[PDB]
Ligand SMILES: *[C@@H]1O[C@H](CO)[C@@H](O[C@@H]2O[C@H](CO)[C@@H](O)[C@H](O)[C@H]2NC(C)=O)[C@H](O)[C@H]1NC(C)=O
């Protein structure tokens with residue numbers, strides 16, 4: 001009988017441009033590649049890994065950019081009723097992030113109830129559950145655009161950062177699901193221009209290790225990377241919806257052997273990741289906007 005499966009696309013840093021035509025050729029190519037993937041292989045939902053609207057987000061919930069950069073761009077019929085689950089990046093927080101949360105009630109497929117939140121999924125016709133914790137790494141660690149270094153040196157509100165961290169610790173300690181995923185804009189590990197996010201390495205990584213998280217999904221660096229540590233924890237970096245950056249500036253800031261796949265060709269149109277979860281395993285497939293498949297690897301069921 002048909003294998004039970006939950007499928008989703010994880011695209012990051014897709015948020016167009018504030019000048020006409022409010023998209024890039026890369027966003028357009030990825031919206032069409034995503035449509036082909038959902039049409040042929042299927043998607044239960046799409047996960048945005050932040051930087052939803054370059055370069056200063058939206059002003060309010062009626063901002064025209066919602067139509068120009070998001071709705072009209074991802075408009076192939078095959079994407080019509082695919083829910084999106086959203087989190088925010090640094091450029092979103094240069095603007096009005098409550099506007100993006102409030103847009104949840106304007107557009108059906110846009111789901112973004114709060115800066116951070118938990119998603120729960122059962123795989124159909126199985127007892128296998130999936131948990132996804134959507135983080136706001138900007139309020140946890142600070143806006144990278146607030147610093148010349150562009151590395152978030154500290155959060156702007158101590159109570160918020162502490163509150164969200166206590167929330168993560170609690171949720172992760174009690175999460176009994178078969179696969180547990182954590183997502184946020186900033187990378188834990190990354191070999192590229194931004195590199196590892198010290199705040200997440202020091203505060204988030206230990207929790208991911210203690211509670212046996214399946215994978216951490218992120219964007220922020222504008223390319224595609226798979227990383228994996230000695231404990232089997234996977235790092236899915238998908239930040240190539242709009243830009244492609246071949247930098248390897250931080251290659252030796254990531255522990256030796258972590259990097260398992262990297263693609264950042266400056267002339268590529270970008271890409272995204274395709275996650276398939278069965279009772280057997282979780283698979284991640286990196287797909288170039290050219291429709292090409294670049295890399296596939298598997299992560300085991302937890303506890
Ligand atoms: C941030 O955005 C929120 C969401 O739009 C703003 O609150 C709304 O402001 C709009 C202005 O276009 C009003 O028309 C709405 O009535 C408000 N929301 C609702 C649900 O009624 C908020 O003012 C913005 N904060 C800023 C710009 O500092």
Ligand SMILES: [Fe+3]
Pocket residue numbers: 013051089220221222
């Ligand atoms: Fe970005």
Ligand SMILES: [Fe+3]
Pocket residue numbers: 051089090091185219220221
């Ligand atoms: Fe970013």
Ligand code: NA
Pocket residue numbers: 103104105106107108109110111
């Ligand atoms: Na909605």
